[PDB]
Design a protein around this ligand. Sequence first.
Ligand SMILES: *[C@@H]1O[C@H](CO)[C@@H](O[C@@H]2O[C@H](CO)[C@@H](O[C@@H]3O[C@H](CO)[C@@H](O)[C@H](O)[C@@H]3O)[C@H](O)[C@H]2NC(C)=O)[C@H](O)[C@H]1NC(C)=O
Ligand SMILES: *[C@@H]1O[C@H](CO)[C@@H](O[C@@H]2O[C@H](CO)[C@@H](O)[C@H](O)[C@H]2NC(C)=O)[C@H](O)[C@H]1NC(C)=O
Ligand SMILES: *[C@@H]1O[C@H](CO)[C@@H](O[C@@H]2O[C@H](CO)[C@@H](O)[C@H](O)[C@H]2NC(C)=O)[C@H](O)[C@H]1NC(C)=O
Ligand SMILES: *[C@@H]1O[C@H](CO)[C@@H](O[C@@H]2O[C@H](CO)[C@@H](O)[C@H](O)[C@H]2NC(C)=O)[C@H](O)[C@H]1NC(C)=O
Ligand SMILES: *[C@@H]1O[C@H](CO)[C@@H](O[C@@H]2O[C@H](CO)[C@@H](O)[C@H](O)[C@H]2NC(C)=O)[C@H](O)[C@H]1NC(C)=O
Ligand SMILES: *[C@@H]1O[C@H](CO)[C@@H](O[C@@H]2O[C@H](CO)[C@@H](O)[C@H](O)[C@H]2NC(C)=O)[C@H](O)[C@H]1NC(C)=O
Ligand SMILES: *[C@@H]1O[C@H](CO)[C@@H](O[C@@H]2O[C@H](CO)[C@@H](O)[C@H](O)[C@H]2NC(C)=O)[C@H](O)[C@H]1NC(C)=O
Ligand SMILES: *[C@@H]1O[C@H](CO)[C@@H](O[C@@H]2O[C@H](CO)[C@@H](O)[C@H](O)[C@H]2NC(C)=O)[C@H](O)[C@H]1NC(C)=O
Ligand SMILES: *[C@@H]1O[C@H](CO)[C@@H](O)[C@H](O)[C@H]1NC(C)=O
Ligand SMILES: *[C@@H]1O[C@H](CO)[C@@H](O)[C@H](O)[C@H]1NC(C)=O
Ligand SMILES: *[C@@H]1O[C@H](CO)[C@@H](O)[C@H](O)[C@H]1NC(C)=O
Ligand SMILES: *[C@@H]1O[C@H](CO)[C@@H](O)[C@H](O)[C@H]1NC(C)=O
Ligand SMILES: *[C@@H]1O[C@H](CO)[C@@H](O)[C@H](O)[C@H]1NC(C)=O
Lengths: 202, 217, 271, 199, 37, 49, 50
Amino acid sequence: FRSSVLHSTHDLFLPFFSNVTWFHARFDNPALPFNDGVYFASTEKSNIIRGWIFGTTLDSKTQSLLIVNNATNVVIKVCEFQFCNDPFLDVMESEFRVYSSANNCTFEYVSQPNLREFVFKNIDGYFKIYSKHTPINLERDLPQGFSALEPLVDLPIGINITRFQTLLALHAAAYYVGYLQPRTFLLKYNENGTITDAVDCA
Amino acid sequence: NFNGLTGTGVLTESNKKFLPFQQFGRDIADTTDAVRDPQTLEILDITPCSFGGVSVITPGTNTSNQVAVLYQGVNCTEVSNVFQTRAGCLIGAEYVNNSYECDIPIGAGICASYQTQSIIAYTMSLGAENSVAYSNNSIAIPTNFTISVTTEILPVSMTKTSVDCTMYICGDSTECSNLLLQYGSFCTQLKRALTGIAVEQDKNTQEVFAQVKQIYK
Amino acid sequence: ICGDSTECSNLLLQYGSFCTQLKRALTGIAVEQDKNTQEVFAQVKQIYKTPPIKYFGGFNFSQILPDPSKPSKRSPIEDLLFNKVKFNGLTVLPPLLTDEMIAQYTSALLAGTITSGWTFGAGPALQIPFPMQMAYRFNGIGVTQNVLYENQKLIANQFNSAIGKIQDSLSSTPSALGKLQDVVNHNAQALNTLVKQLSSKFGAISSVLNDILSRLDPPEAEVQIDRLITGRLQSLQTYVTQQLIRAAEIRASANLAATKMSECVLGQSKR
Amino acid sequence: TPSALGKLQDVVNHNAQALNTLVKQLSSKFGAISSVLNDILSRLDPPEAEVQIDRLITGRLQSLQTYVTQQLIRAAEIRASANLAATKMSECVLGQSKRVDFCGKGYHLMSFPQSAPHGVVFLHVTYVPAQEKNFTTAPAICHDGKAHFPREGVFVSNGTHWFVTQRNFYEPQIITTDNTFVSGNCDVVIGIVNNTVYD
Amino acid sequence: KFNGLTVLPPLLTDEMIAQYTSALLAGTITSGWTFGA
Amino acid sequence: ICGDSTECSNLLLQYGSFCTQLKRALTGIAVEQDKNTQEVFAQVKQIYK
Amino acid sequence: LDPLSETKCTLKSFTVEKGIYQTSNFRVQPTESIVRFPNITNLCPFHEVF
Ligand SMILES: *[C@@H]1O[C@H](CO)[C@@H](O[C@@H]2O[C@H](CO)[C@@H](O[C@@H]3O[C@H](CO)[C@@H](O)[C@H](O)[C@@H]3O)[C@H](O)[C@H]2NC(C)=O)[C@H](O)[C@H]1NC(C)=O
Ligand SMILES: *[C@@H]1O[C@H](CO)[C@@H](O[C@@H]2O[C@H](CO)[C@@H](O)[C@H](O)[C@H]2NC(C)=O)[C@H](O)[C@H]1NC(C)=O
Ligand SMILES: *[C@@H]1O[C@H](CO)[C@@H](O[C@@H]2O[C@H](CO)[C@@H](O)[C@H](O)[C@H]2NC(C)=O)[C@H](O)[C@H]1NC(C)=O
Ligand SMILES: *[C@@H]1O[C@H](CO)[C@@H](O[C@@H]2O[C@H](CO)[C@@H](O)[C@H](O)[C@H]2NC(C)=O)[C@H](O)[C@H]1NC(C)=O
Ligand SMILES: *[C@@H]1O[C@H](CO)[C@@H](O[C@@H]2O[C@H](CO)[C@@H](O)[C@H](O)[C@H]2NC(C)=O)[C@H](O)[C@H]1NC(C)=O
Ligand SMILES: *[C@@H]1O[C@H](CO)[C@@H](O[C@@H]2O[C@H](CO)[C@@H](O)[C@H](O)[C@H]2NC(C)=O)[C@H](O)[C@H]1NC(C)=O
Ligand SMILES: *[C@@H]1O[C@H](CO)[C@@H](O[C@@H]2O[C@H](CO)[C@@H](O)[C@H](O)[C@H]2NC(C)=O)[C@H](O)[C@H]1NC(C)=O
Ligand SMILES: *[C@@H]1O[C@H](CO)[C@@H](O[C@@H]2O[C@H](CO)[C@@H](O)[C@H](O)[C@H]2NC(C)=O)[C@H](O)[C@H]1NC(C)=O
Ligand SMILES: *[C@@H]1O[C@H](CO)[C@@H](O)[C@H](O)[C@H]1NC(C)=O
Ligand SMILES: *[C@@H]1O[C@H](CO)[C@@H](O)[C@H](O)[C@H]1NC(C)=O
Ligand SMILES: *[C@@H]1O[C@H](CO)[C@@H](O)[C@H](O)[C@H]1NC(C)=O
Ligand SMILES: *[C@@H]1O[C@H](CO)[C@@H](O)[C@H](O)[C@H]1NC(C)=O
Ligand SMILES: *[C@@H]1O[C@H](CO)[C@@H](O)[C@H](O)[C@H]1NC(C)=O
């Protein structure tokens, strides 16, 4: 906790005015890379994107991270298998068969799951997850103003992650994918401890 | 010990209102300011415990053996005529309302003295009250005078010191000198500074006293 | 250096007596500050009080004379000056002469210089009307007393108008008190850097001594503690050297201020 | 009176204490097994004794650097004090200084230097007024429709007559046309008085 | 003193400083401020 | 201290802000020299020809 | 024994002059060692085995 004080750090952050790619759905799943971290954004008019997948060797040779989620509770499992080739969620309208194989896993984190942002980090032994929700009320590019994402779960896992994909549902969508880089940042903390302003020193 | 945070101090209930995802905080100096109890979710502030140097008030061994102690920056309730001032807790001297000249500087306008015998504490007296009778047409003209001689002492120089760097560091050892020669010209810079100070003392002594070219008898 | 421990002192004792040198330097600086304050502000022998009714020949000293209408009994200019300008082993000592004593000294100096001219600085305070004192000063600067005895009203109006703008000048320009703002900011940043250096590692495993004493073997924990001690001792030495340099500068500035007080307030310098 | 010569005593004590600290740091073993080089060389082999010799050299180098920095600061202070003493000599002994409270407290007349160990003592002979008496004053005197101002002295009155005396001593002389000069008229001084001026 | 540290004697001894002081005193009692200029 | 060394630059960061103190002292000396030059020679307000 | 003797020791002299002298640093000592940890829950299924 910090209050009414400025602080600086050299951790992973998304550079300001970076060339963040815009990916619209007719599914657009080329299995984007994952160097050290990615910035995910979702602003569609529904909840079609309700999952994430992480891993390095997804051809059933190395453990992978699943962030499968629905409208009730998240299903985070760390197992080693290829789903079929790539995720495909076809939802009485209640079905879930994106993967046709199972193996020996190590995690069953099922604690808890109109613009929503997600920042993932792959530190040595804790897959960090950050989330935040802010209204938009307009139809344009990413709005102005700062919005600091708060930590959600530590997810203690030691699996390497170099590729990630987006889980989409069906019977149109869009999402923003970014990449973090290590550079010095300046953070401003208010009296309540919330980050309001930030300056990218580079 | 809060989930691994090791320290020692005073825990006190505070209202800093930490956010749900954070449980401990730090000040601008990266010093732990508060930590939240992981059991009852209570947030409490951590304050370092009182510390301060003890300054003994000695009126002189040749006069009396009675002494007073001063715990700087602490409260008297955390440490005999105990007295609390802005400089700390004063023990061994009673506070008097009479003001005198500051003999032993204690702090925050308070000074101690050995008067009729016990050590007493009092506020500093800046001087005697003097109300000049100012008026539209009042002038004061002296009718006499006094010739006063005031002594003023000023240092002119100090001891000219010269230190043998190799002999001080090694002391007649060659194996030590072989390693000393690796560090560089430190022994040369120090010798140069010492010689500069030595010639500077003589220059000062020359500039102060030798201001005439003839020795008048 | 060690902090929240008792075994690190055994390794610290092997470094000699640098602690005594640092403590002696700090005490010397502390007594030097009070000596400078006394040499600057305690130049008067007695505390002179202003008369009830001022009427200083038309001159208005309300901006600099004290008033009991507000606490601390300070003047409006001094009030604006005072309004315009956490322990980890280090402490701040309170000055010997508090703000009230310095204010009383300044008020006594002002009363003596407005009711006696330069007589009280050389000896007994000789009562003299302020127009007569101004005439003596005009004769000292090489101007006949007739120029003042014919333009007393104009000179009083000019003095009042010049004094009234001092507050506006010092308020509209925050850089006027920069010479003191820089000093207080340097002291604050020196303290904050000395206390921040405790979070560094200097090539060790962790900045906390208790973490090293609970994660490594003694033969390596001692090396880590030695590295931390060397780093913090170098930090303390740098801090003490910078404090000594700043103290020498402050002593020079205080000697200059005391000389200026004695030559301008207690008299009339021709320099 | 004690502590009269405390300034030079403080300097010599600081020098002696610096020397004592420098000679005491020699016996401090900075992480080595011993503080004597002979006890390390005659006990350990060169490749193992060099490790302790390096620590001793580092410690003694740090001690010497600290001593030299303190000596430089003290030498700068001594140079400032010596420049002040030379200015005091030149302005009080070689001449009379009009600077207030520079050559002692009071109106400086003359000063005499005195030799002292590593210092100088000045005997400032000053002029201090005493036995002050107050009288009634007036900025000017209006006589024959014109204002008269004092040339060198000041106007004083003991209650029945008016005289002119110097500012630093009481010498009531008769107010005449030689010790006063005329300027302006009778109606420009707010505190002017009616008094005759002898010719 | 035997640890490589020695004290150098001052150039002007106490007798010469005393002679300078006596010369200044004689000049200021016999010539005033004229000998300084 | 390093001279274009990547491994040395990362190790220098564990010493704190000593480099910052040195840089601040050097900038203070630099501005002090200019302040002295201004206070000594620029006492007049107008350039009298 | 007494603060006067402590002053004599910190000054390394039997005769002490008139004034104040910092002899030692006082601080209050800790009384209890408190170990704080979250709720002891989510016990491993040792009962389901043994
Ligand atoms: C596990 O965590 C729970 C949740 O904090 C702990 O239960 C809590 O225990 C405290 C202390 O007994 C309760 O506070 C008390 O609440 C009552 C009202 O119910 C109030 O009248 C008392 O003055 C006091 O404030 C708290 O209510 C209770 N919370 C719940 C949800 O039961 C529990 O002690 C923890 N267990 C262990 C082994 O740490
Ligand atoms: C972000 O990156 C993309 C792809 O590298 C850039 O798009 C290219 O821009 C250049 C320059 O205008 C064109 O010649 C190319 O045809 C574009 N497409 C590709 C695939 O290279 C885009 O300009 C970048 N945006 C920013 C702000 O840097
Ligand atoms: C939504 O997800 C939750 C879990 O995040 C599902 O709840 C579990 O469903 C499985 C069936 O795959 C059951 O075996 C578990 O017992 C359920 N857990 C609980 C706590 O009920 C839920 O069924 C999912 N809903 C839909 C419509 O897919
Ligand atoms: C579940 O899969 C993991 C991942 O392969 C297994 O962990 C490996 O176990 C083998 C056993 O010989 C080791 O050689 C590997 O080094 C382990 N992997 C890593 C990354 O260390 C785990 O054993 C499997 N569990 C079961 C019950 O089969
Ligand atoms: C000025 O003061 C001096 C003393 O400072 C006076 O000299 C004294 O005069 C009395 C009266 O005749 C003698 O009894 C004393 O012996 C004198 N003292 C000395 C030291 O000589 C002097 O009279 C005063 N003058 C005036 C005009 O008041
Ligand atoms: C001396 O100056 C003060 C301040 O400039 C004068 O006080 C002002 O008086 C006027 C007229 O009564 C008021 O309107 C202002 O509000 C006062 N200002 C303050 C700050 O008090 C004071 O009158 C002046 N003295 C004389 C004799 O005129
Ligand atoms: C003020 O001084 C004058 C001048 O000395 C005094 O006048 C003299 O007073 C004495 C005493 O009565 C007479 O003997 C002289 O003849 C007076 N001289 C002249 C020229 O008149 C006067 O008395 C003093 N007044 C007071 C109140 O002290
Ligand atoms: C000084 O002398 C002048 C001139 O004699 C006096 O002024 C006269 O005062 C009377 C009484 O008030 C008037 O009737 C005359 O008209 C005035 N004459 C002139 C030329 O103005 C004055 O009163 C005397 N006293 C003072 C203190 O000035
Ligand atoms: C994962 O990364 C670590 C660290 O770089 C490396 O040692 C290990 O070989 C990697 N494993 C795989 C399967 O890539
Ligand atoms: C902190 O939260 C309180 C909640 O009532 C709010 O009133 C206040 O404005 C907030 N302060 C900041 C700086 O956000
Ligand atoms: C000392 O403690 C008492 C009681 O806690 C308190 O009333 C008093 O104000 C404290 N003194 C100081 C100087 O803080
Ligand atoms: C001075 O004169 C003024 C008016 O001119 C008057 O009010 C005051 O009482 C006189 N005396 C003093 C001591 O101010
Ligand atoms: C002279 O001063 C004294 C004391 O200040 C006072 O009692 C006396 O009335 C004054 N006399 C005159 C004429 O002002």
